Symmetry: C3
Subunit: 334 residues, 3 copies
């Protein structure tokens, strides 16, 4: 293989590079020198490790294609990623839509996806809400509020926002009481087909630790609720829920084709399921998510349609190999 698969050494590089290896690619990890043993000693999946944030020149010399991990754009910056000369697997135009909460909402609405209600004016708050500070990833700064007046008290406490607006591009969103579900998709541009790869429940601290503390005991912890991502727990869904989850994925792809020149490769809809079986989506994560890391040896969904273990990392490598073999590699790269 002429093409090598390259990834930023974080988030899901082990899965991505093992999958590339399994498909006959030579593999490149780049990033901190601190994490190098992980990819070369403990799990020898990287044929090359480059101790640089973005080694453009060497990657071009190695015929690298970058498979973006879930923190690649974060560590490098969206300006650098969009001007990179090294080929990028997926559509770069998708990046602006997922960095803007209003563009996220516009995308979801067009794709006919159920979303929580949003309030521009805090005085209109009619039900418990979750407040999302601008540009926040990983749920940092998030806090809960019950009514218009509880919001102002906490807005001044956490964000310093004096009463009566000056709301620095925060999002005030209806808190939806449902169980967290994260379906992982893959859209094949080569096969013109959408697949369900797997599903997980993200494991977050301290939010998934507080239910172990009895109600009576919680006060003296002086608890602030945090949504720091720690890990992932494998799940399957109720089978009768699969069709609407998959259709939601189809509409998301179709909407992206009409808004941003398409969505292909891995993606995830992060949301909850309510007691009335509704899937309410908080965001479209148009990338490989950490949840796919469970399924190195395939998932309960891939094993229904494949004779071998297929992770999202392997599926990415499969797509790139098939694009090369079908003489259409440029079609999946931007």
């Amino acid at each position: 293989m002429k093409v090598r698969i390259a990834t930023y050494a974080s988030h899901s590089a082990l899965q991505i590079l093992k999958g590339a290896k399994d498909e006959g690619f030579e593999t490149i990890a780049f990033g901190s020198s601190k994490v190098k043993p992980l990819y070369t000693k403990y799990f020898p999946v990287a044929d090359y490790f480059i101790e640089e944030k973005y080694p453009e020149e060497e990657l071009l010399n190695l015929n690298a294609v970058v498979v973006p991990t879930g923190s690649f754009v974060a560590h490098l910056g969206i300006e650098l990623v969009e001007n990179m000369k090294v080929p990028y697997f997926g559509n770069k135009r998708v990046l602006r839509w997922e960095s803007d909460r209003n563009l996220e909402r516009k995308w979801l609405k067009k794709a006919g996806i159920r979303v929580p209600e949003v309030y521009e004016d805090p005085d209109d708050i009619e039900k418990p809400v979750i407040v999302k500070p601008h540009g926040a990833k990983g749920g940092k700064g998030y806090f809960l509020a019950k009514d218009p007046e509880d919001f102002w008290r906490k807005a001044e406490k956490f964000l310093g926002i004096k009463r009566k607006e000056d709301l620095k591009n925060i999002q005030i969103q209806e808190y939806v009481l449902g169980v967290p579900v994260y379906p992982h998709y893959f859209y094949s541009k080569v096969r013109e087909e959408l697949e369900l790869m797997s599903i997980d429940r993200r494991y977050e601290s301290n939010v998934d630790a507080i239910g172990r503390i009895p109600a009576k005991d919680q006060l003296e912890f002086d608890m602030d609720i945090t949504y720091t991502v720690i890990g992932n727990i494998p799940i399957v869904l109720r089978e009768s829920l699969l069709m609407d989850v998959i259709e939601a994925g189809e509409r998301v792809v179709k909407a992206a084709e009409e808004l941003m020149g398409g969505l292909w490769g891995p993606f995830c809809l992060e949301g909850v399921f309510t007691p009335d079986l509704e899937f309410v989506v908080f965001e479209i994560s148009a990338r490989i998510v950490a949840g796919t890391n469970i399924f190195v040896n395939g998932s309960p969904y891939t094993w229904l349609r494949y004779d071998r273990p297929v992770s999202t990392g392997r599926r990415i490598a499969m797509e790139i190999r098939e694009a090369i073999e079908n003489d259409m590699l440029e079609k999946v790269l931007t």
Copy 2:
């Protein structure tokens, strides 16, 4: 194979039909036109899709044997299923025992299984209870009550029961504080052997969502607790607990042989494990349960005794195949 394997297009049909494929059976899904793509496009495991609730005529023409799913008896009704001319994998006589809470309880008691205390008279309520509306499936309408007068308030609210009796065959049950555990079994009539297939913990909304909300913020939601089934999470048990769980299944099978002409094929005991390590069971589900859907690529338990992936779906197809090969297919069908 002469015999084709047919299932209702919901609940566990993907697993069942994939398992049948793996054992050399042609496959049939029947149900809603809405779900056809799931079984023919996204996961092509059904060689025939029939867009009818119960196409008896066509099923007989195709030499079908019906493997019952979770939704099958409910959608088609207990009487139709009882009188169906199409062969049914498992014992149909079991259905009347599981549709009645008094009969379930008698069956469990005879099998020496730990069950929660029940209350006929609401005045006798001394510890917290769970109230189960008549005929209710999937946790529909369940509510908690602390004492007699608190029961009466909520019974009027949720069920329209005026104070002082006329309890329309409602079940009032001791709430057992233990962790939900769902062992999945298979009894082979061909082998005369009980197997432990897998274990899961069912994932339910909003009940598994409320522990993410701090005590102080819970009252703002006006939470009615619900047990809508959303998905399934894989587990294993502490090893010293397996013998008790396996002996429980043996007694359940032995009790069914003396009561209802036997229990064979898949079943699940649904319950909790308390701090004193006791397995308290709420019901026997005498069918394939959704939790088995995790284990398409086998389970930590099947991989201890097989050299290949064995789901409950595949295990059924194995049983049917070996029955045909041992000229005893009629023994496993009613």
Copy 3:
């Protein structure tokens, strides 16, 4: 194979004996006659079952090497295990270091592992604490105290403690609010190398059941919080946390080399992950833990570096085999 692999019939014997089987060893289970069917009928993994707590003479005649399980030291007692003539996979000198919570902490400190604050004087309690009775196993007898006043009231109720003079070797430990995580390690003495085998979240009763009860309803239960081990749930971690977890294992092995003549074979670091991504460790479990039982068919981590399913049990058998073939069997046995 001359050498046979022997193990006490509990905790993780199924995984261990199946692992030995896969590596070409004849297998021995020893323990209660009550559990014999588990190991010989339901999962036929034991070539020999001996109905004795510790059958030294028979084990010597069968050329046995004992792979220690969870309850092995508990059942036999520390001194008998220290004086056994049958070879022991691992370092027996480790046993005193993990039986003593002071020596545990001395080991953790030398290994530069983050640990919770400990209180010798209950008047100094400024944050909520967990109280651990002397020598308590399986988290039993543990209770939460939220302040100095709450400690004395619960210490009197549960233990009969009235003042500082009679604290009777209880450990008062800062309650760390974080999600439970249990990484499973293997240090190969043959290959002089540390591996990450898998990770789980231990499933405990009633602590993991109480979050299903709404805060308003919790007081009616009069809850004693318990940490009784019931089962295990598979997880993966966030990728950027793996080096943290792996380096922690390295320092534990290194500190053991200076302190106790080394640590090889399976071990686990039991702890939590806080919102600021700290791995705070409660104890070193210097043995195979029950969380490994999920991964009979390998783990999301072993599948990154192996072409076949590798459990901790199999990995142990691999080590013993390779030690024999490299003529260094005596190096891994005490």
